[PDB]
Amino acid sequence: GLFGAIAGFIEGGWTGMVDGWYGYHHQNEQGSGYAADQKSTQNAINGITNKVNSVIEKMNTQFTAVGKEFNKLERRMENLNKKVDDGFIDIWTYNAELLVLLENERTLDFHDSNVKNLYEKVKSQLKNNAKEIGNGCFEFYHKCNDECMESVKNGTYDYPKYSEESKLNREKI
């Protein structure tokens, strides 16, 4: 939670999100639903796939990792082989566990940053047309049909044609 979006100012997740990660909930007049944000979730899934596959493939493959056996007169050799195997295992355990933990944290704040960047993206597209509330939600001042969603998720939300309507709704009396 470095960027403080997930578990920050977006208190809880959504159980109905099944198609994508960083979706929406457009409680507009024409209907509702949990349409995902295809660009952001596709890029995020791509990124995590690169991360995991890099973790797998970079590990080189060799045909043996087996400690050999020794009789009762090569206790030096047996102890040395045990030291090599145990040191390799210790280094691998430390490195692998610190990795797993560290890029677990990187994955968490990367999802945090994706939700963040999405939030500031929508906020910049809307500027002051739609007021902000808690939980990362929004409140469009103007009348808002489904074409809003088309423009919002394609990034082509043209501010000026809805500007004056919001200006009227700022006070409304």
Epitope: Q38, K39, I45, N46, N50, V52, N53, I56, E57, N154
Partner: antibody, heavy 121, light 107 residues
Framework: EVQLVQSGAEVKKPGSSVRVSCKAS??????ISWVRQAPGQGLEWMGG????????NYAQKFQGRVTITADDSTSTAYMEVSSLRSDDTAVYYC????????????????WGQGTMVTVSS | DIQMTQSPSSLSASVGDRVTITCRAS??????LNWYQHKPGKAPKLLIF???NLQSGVPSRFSGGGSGTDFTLTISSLQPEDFATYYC?????????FGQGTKVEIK
């Protein structure tokens, strides 16, 4: 460049199950896609899973009849279709979802080679 | 859910010509298109992914383009080793629908 080695060629009676493998060369977590090449018809994507979500998505005209499972342990995708019928005679192609710009999702990247699955008498 | 209507259905040409394959989509799929050539009796393989990028190990004569509901694939010139049917895929939303197939044959 993951050398996908799909299963061999097999035939079965109508109204049964099929098992077509997509055994890869190296451990990979990119998505899996399966496509039907019926003779004379074009490609159409049937089903597929994303090892990130873990959910198994399917075509809206195929769900239930077809299931896809790919254990992350071996990264080998399995192909099951229940209640086989004659017009499903085709050759099956498996995609590993990996282009030059890393593992990207929404593309096909490298492809399989083909498994002849003909349903007849 | 979204149908990929290939256009034109099928034409013929010769070595070193100008051909355009248009993929039409009902709903806007942004720029998550593909372009697969399918040799008869061979594994299919893509040319352009995300409607602009070029796959590695592919001649530069293929140049995709377009976004939204109108797309394109502009071949610079035709050689005798790239005559086949062509498909366009959408991946903006599931399900993933392929195309009809535009064949090119010796004039």
């Amino acid at each position: 460049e993951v050398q996908l080695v799909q299963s061999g060629a097999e035939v079965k009676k109508p109204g049964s199950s099929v098992r077509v493998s997509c055994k890869a060369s190296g451990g990979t977590f990119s998505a899996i896609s399966w496509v039907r090449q019926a003779p004379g018809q074009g490609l159409e994507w049937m089903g597929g899973i994303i090892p990130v979500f873990g959910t198994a998505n399917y075509a809206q005209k195929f769900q239930g009849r077809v299931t896809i499972t790919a254990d992350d342990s071996t990264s080998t995708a399995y192909m099951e279709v229940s209640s086989l019928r004659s017009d499903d005679t085709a050759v099956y192609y498996c995609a590993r979802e990996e282009t030059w710009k890393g593992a990207t999702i929404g593309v096909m990247g490298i492809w399989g080679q083909g498994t002849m699955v003909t349903v007849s008498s | 859910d979204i149908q990929m209507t290939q256009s034109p259905s099928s034409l013929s040409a010769s070595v070193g010509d100008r051909v355009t394959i248009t993929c039409r989509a009902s709903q806007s799929i942004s720029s998550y298109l593909n372009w697969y050539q399918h040799k008869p009796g061979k594994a299919p393989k893509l040319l352009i992914f995300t409607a602009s990028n070029l796959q590695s190990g592919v001649p530069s004569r293929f140049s995709g383009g377009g976004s939204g509901t109108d797309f394109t694939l502009t071949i610079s010139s035709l050689q005798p080793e790239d005559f086949a049917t062509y498909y366009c895929q959408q991946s903006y939303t599931s399900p993933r629908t392929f195309g009809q197939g535009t064949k090119v044959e010796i004039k």
